[PDB]
Design a protein around this ligand. Sequence first.
Ligand SMILES: C=Cc1cc2c(N3CCC4(CC3)CN(C(=O)CC)C4)nc(OC3CCN(C)CC3)nc2c(OCC)c1-c1c(C)ccc2[nH]ncc12
Ligand SMILES: Nc1nc2c(ncn2[C@@H]2O[C@H](COP(=O)(O)OP(=O)(O)O)[C@@H](O)[C@H]2O)c(=O)[nH]1
Ligand SMILES: [Mg+2]
Length: 164
Amino acid sequence: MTEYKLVVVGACGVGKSALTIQLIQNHFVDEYDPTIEDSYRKQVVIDGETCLLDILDTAGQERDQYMRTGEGFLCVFAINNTKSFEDIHHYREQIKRVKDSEDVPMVLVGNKSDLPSRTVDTKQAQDLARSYGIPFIETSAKTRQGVDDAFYTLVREIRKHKEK
Ligand SMILES: C=Cc1cc2c(N3CCC4(CC3)CN(C(=O)CC)C4)nc(OC3CCN(C)CC3)nc2c(OCC)c1-c1c(C)ccc2[nH]ncc12
Ligand SMILES: Nc1nc2c(ncn2[C@@H]2O[C@H](COP(=O)(O)OP(=O)(O)O)[C@@H](O)[C@H]2O)c(=O)[nH]1
Ligand SMILES: [Mg+2]
């Protein structure tokens, strides 16, 4: 059984917890306590390989130890929160710093696609991920659009970087 350490990052309110809950439990949550940071588990056979996903859902204060052993990063913004999207450059800079690498397994996630009248357009997200050399996945923790893609793609990005 192969372990993968995943770290979900992004601003308050983007849907980090909701996306994780959708992965573990296959249902959309309305609230979830913004003060809870923990690491959760999910066992899935991905491409014939029994995986144990260790998904750290971040929260708390505005630490290198935890982040340094992250193998892949889910960088999440909400498509109706321009600031959360603009924040992604900061999170990427800081992740690179701690891995001392230009090539860190990373997936850019645009969450809340079920919400009307987005303020961050898919072109803006697609351009950013292209510039980073990383996949972009649009999600809705509400429908569940893209939730599997986001996590399975990150696992695959990790494999691409290193033997597992
Ligand atoms: C994940 C660690 C982290 C979080 C924040 C952060 N969080 C706020 C958002 C939540 C967690 C963390 C998610 N939460 C919730 O869901 C509850 C509502 C709270 N915010 C800001 O900075 C902000 C944003 C960009 N602005 C331009 C300036 C100020 N930086 C952060 C930061 O980099 C620190 C430089 C790091 C960080 C990284 C990536 C890498 C190594 C590191 N080691 N130690 C910190 C750190
Ligand atoms: N319509 C909609 N609401 C969402 C979605 N994802 C999260 N939310 C809501 O956004 C709010 C904050 O989400 P939460 O998962 O706590 O965000 P966090 O701070 O990143 O963990 C909650 O009320 C969620 O129900 C989504 O994909 N669509
Ligand atoms: Mg949360």
